[PDB]
């Protein structure tokens, strides 16, 4: 029995990075030979495993995390890299084992005039733990007591939009990215093939 790789890669509507979408994949005969036929795969790299030797190994539990980010920020989705989206709304451990897959999707996410539907967290109190998600949209702290969802000396608001348009350079075009996380220790294997 096969498992939904055609649902996490061909999902109907991807999520924004500050509210990424986890999914579990177990109890199937996993086939990694369908991914290559998807896209030219602007980013396809694996930590702890090779992509060609993927179709013969067995794993314990496989998570799949999908979201959408900018072009020049794909480099931040890697262990131990400090940035702004790898700091405030998606962090993965320094002991990572898995793969990341990112492909350009300016075809489907860029509206003419600006797509103000993909937002990301810009302000937080402290950096967040690996694989942690927060959705609260509380107003951020300022030097003095913030205003009230309005302008002022500082009194800022946390989230910021993206503004994708079809003419933006490749560095500012929207990219869809999905991350697979495996486990290998003392495995009474549940998913492989």
């Amino acid at each position: 029995n096969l498992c939904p790789f055609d649902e996490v890669f061909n999902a109907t509507r991807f999520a924004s990075v500050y509210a990424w979408n986890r999914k579990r994949i177990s109890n199937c005969v996993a086939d990694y030979s369908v991914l290559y036929n998807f896209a030219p795969f602007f980013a396809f790299k694996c930590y702890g495993v090779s992509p060609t030797k993927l179709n013969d190994l067995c794993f314990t539990n496989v998570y799949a995390d999908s979201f959408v980010i900018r072009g020049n920020e794909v480099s931040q989705i890697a262990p131990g890299q400090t940035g702004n989206i790898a700091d405030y709304n998606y962090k993965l451990p320094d002991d990572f084992t898995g793969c990341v897959i990112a492909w350009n999707s300016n075809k489907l996410d860029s509206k003419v005039g600006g797509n103000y539907n993909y937002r990301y967290r810009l302000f937080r109190k402290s950096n967040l733990k690996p694989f942690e998600r927060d959705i609260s949209t509380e107003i951020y702290q300022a030097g003095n007591k913030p205003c009230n969802g309005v302008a002022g000396v500082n009194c800022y608001f946390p989230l910021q939009s993206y503004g994708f348009r079809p003419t933006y350079g490749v560095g500012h075009q929207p990219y869809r990215v999905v991350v697979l996380s495996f486990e290998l220790l003392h495995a009474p294997a549940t998913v492989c093939g």
Partner: antibody
Amino acid sequence: ITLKESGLTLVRPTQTLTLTCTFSGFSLINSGVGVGWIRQPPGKALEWLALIYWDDDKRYNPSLRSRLTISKATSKNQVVLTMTNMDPVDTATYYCTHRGPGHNTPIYFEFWGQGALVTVSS
Amino acid sequence: QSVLTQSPSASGTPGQRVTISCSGSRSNIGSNFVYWFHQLPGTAPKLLIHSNDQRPSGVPDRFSGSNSGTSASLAISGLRSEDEADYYCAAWDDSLSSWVFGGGTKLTVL
């Protein structure tokens, strides 16, 4: 991919115009897909009315805003346009058009309807 | 500034190459993609060129597009007799926040 408009083609002034674009070959639940409306007077240049993306982003023509309302009935795969306070200058043909994906940038107005001549008189 | 202007007439002759101009401004034609449509008597228009240089599947090779600063051009090669129709510009204007179009050119072959 096919589109077809329908409604009442003749209406007196100070009444409201309603139009219904029924389509076939795509669904307004996928990413990319969107539907818009474009009118053209008899012997004049084209004019853009309104647009509605798949995530319900109702863009309007500013000068014609405060008069137009576009809405979708996805279950029936159809879009409805409504414009109040019609006038004799609004006699034109109204096309409903489709915006899907291309190969490196979104396509706009790739497919058109067949029009619906609308006369506003007495 | 907020409306594109085209010359009304082209007037080529078979087997020749002609160009059609479209002048805009810093805000609409110089910072967005420029489309180019084609409209025949008694029929809805039909796309010719999007993204200033790309052709939808089903358009012959002879149609070419060009954008340069705040100006746009369409180049038709191998002019033929089945092409005498209206040609329209199209661009999204950020200052007006709407799509704007041009007047149109006749292009009747001799």
